[PDB]
Structure formats: structure tokens, C-alpha cells
Structure 1
């Protein structure tokens, strides 16, 4: 029984450690995504500023 409740604890536990080890990996892939994507828009806010600048000069000729 205690010889066995406890071998049960061992098992249920390893499974959790194993599952949480996969989620750690999942989250860090997801971080690379969010980071790559956050720091790229840094560019996208510049091309947008260049544009609306061109569109105002083009709006002032027409």
C-alpha cells in the first residue's frame, strides 16, 4: 500500500515534470515569434512615416 501509493506518486509526478518540460519549449518558441515580430514592426513604423510624408507632399502638389 505505502510501498505502492508512493510508487504511484513517483509516476504521476514524472509525467507532470515531463509535460511541463514540453510547455517550457513551446513557450520559448512562442517568445522567438513575438520578439522577431515585435522588433520587425520597428521598421514597419518607419516605412509608414516615409509614406504619409510622401502623401502629404503629393497632396500639396495636387
Structure 2
């Protein structure tokens, strides 16, 4: 049993080196896309307020 039970544990642990390399790669990339939206949400929240202050004057002068 043992020699077989460690041989399939070390075979399984061999596979995990690249499983974890993948999982990390994946998350790195999702830490990126979600970093972008957090920046592009401030680009759509400030430029949307700034033109709100503009129409506020255009309709005021009418």
C-alpha cells in the first residue's frame, strides 16, 4: 500500500504545480479587468457630473 500511496500522492502533487500556475495566471488577469472598470467607472462618474453642471447653466440661461 504505502509505496503506491505515496507514488500517487507525489504524482498528484506534480500535476498541481501547473494547476496553481494556471489558477494564479487567471486571477492575475481578473485582478486586471476589475481594476480597469474601477477606473473607467470614475471616468464615467466624473465626466457625467461635469456635463450636468453644464446643462444646469444652459437651461438656466434659457
Q: CA RMSD in A?
A: 1.6
| 1:34-58: CA deviation from partner (whole Å, max 9, x where unpaired) | 1122123222222111111111112
**TM-score, reference length from structure 2:** 0.78
Q: Which runs of 5+ in 2 are unaligned?
A: none
Q: Which residue of 1 aligns with 2:36?
A: 36
Q: Determine which structure has the larger helix proportion and give its number.
A: 1
Task: Compute the TM-score of the two structures, normalised by the length of structure 1.
Answer: 0.78
Structure 1's unaligned 5+ residue stretches are none
